[PDB]
Write a protein that binds this ligand. Structure first.
Ligand code: 75G
Length: 153
């Protein structure tokens, strides 16, 4: 039972965040304690229509979850993924310690929650492997479209 995870001061933030984390597919699968710790450390920010969230080729230190809005990822001007509420992105640079492999732009008013590298390494350590084999699905799209894949391998 979870009464223990929602009793203290931190409980308000813990609770708005938990329904949300419950629909981010790869972390909906973390168990509750681990997921409550993520909720504790999330921060919020917003992007306007047209703003760049991630610029391809830059160093990246931030992991994102989209909680509202529409954003789109492209690489060498090819659309490789559309994002909506519940999606996460920006993990690959944190896992591989390489520059951002793609650009992500807001397509309307977007609200996100995020973790920095130290928080991502600390809290999401238990699942770096599961996150990592999602990357194979990234290869397919890179290949589907004839784009460079050395950013992954
Ligand atoms: N087909 C895809 N290939 C790749 Cl390498 N990254 C993809 C793909 N689709 C989305 N992304 C995401 O765009 C982000 C760009 O900053 P990262 O740290 S490299 O993380 C990246 C991924 O989360």
């Amino acid at each position: 039972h979870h009464e223990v995870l929602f009793q203290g001061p931190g409980a308000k933030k813990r609770k708005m965040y938990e329904d949300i984390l419950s629909h981010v597919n790869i972390l909906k699968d973390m168990d509750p304690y681990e997921r409550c710790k993520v909720a504790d450390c999330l921060k919020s920010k917003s992007y306007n229509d047209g703003e760049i969230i991630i610029k391809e080729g830059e160093e990246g230190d931030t992991f994102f979850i989209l909680i509202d809005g529409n954003a789109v990822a492209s690489k060498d001007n090819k659309v490789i993924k559309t994002y909506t509420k519940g999606d996460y992105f920006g993990e690959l640079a944190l896992l591989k310690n390489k520059p951002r492999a793609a650009t992500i732009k807001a397509q309307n008013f977007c609200q996100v929650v995020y973790l920095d590298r130290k928080s991502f390494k600390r809290l999401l350590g238990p699942i770096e492997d599961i996150l990592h084999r999602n990357v194979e699905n990234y290869k397919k799209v890179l290949n589907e479209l004839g784009l460079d894949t050395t950013c992954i391998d």
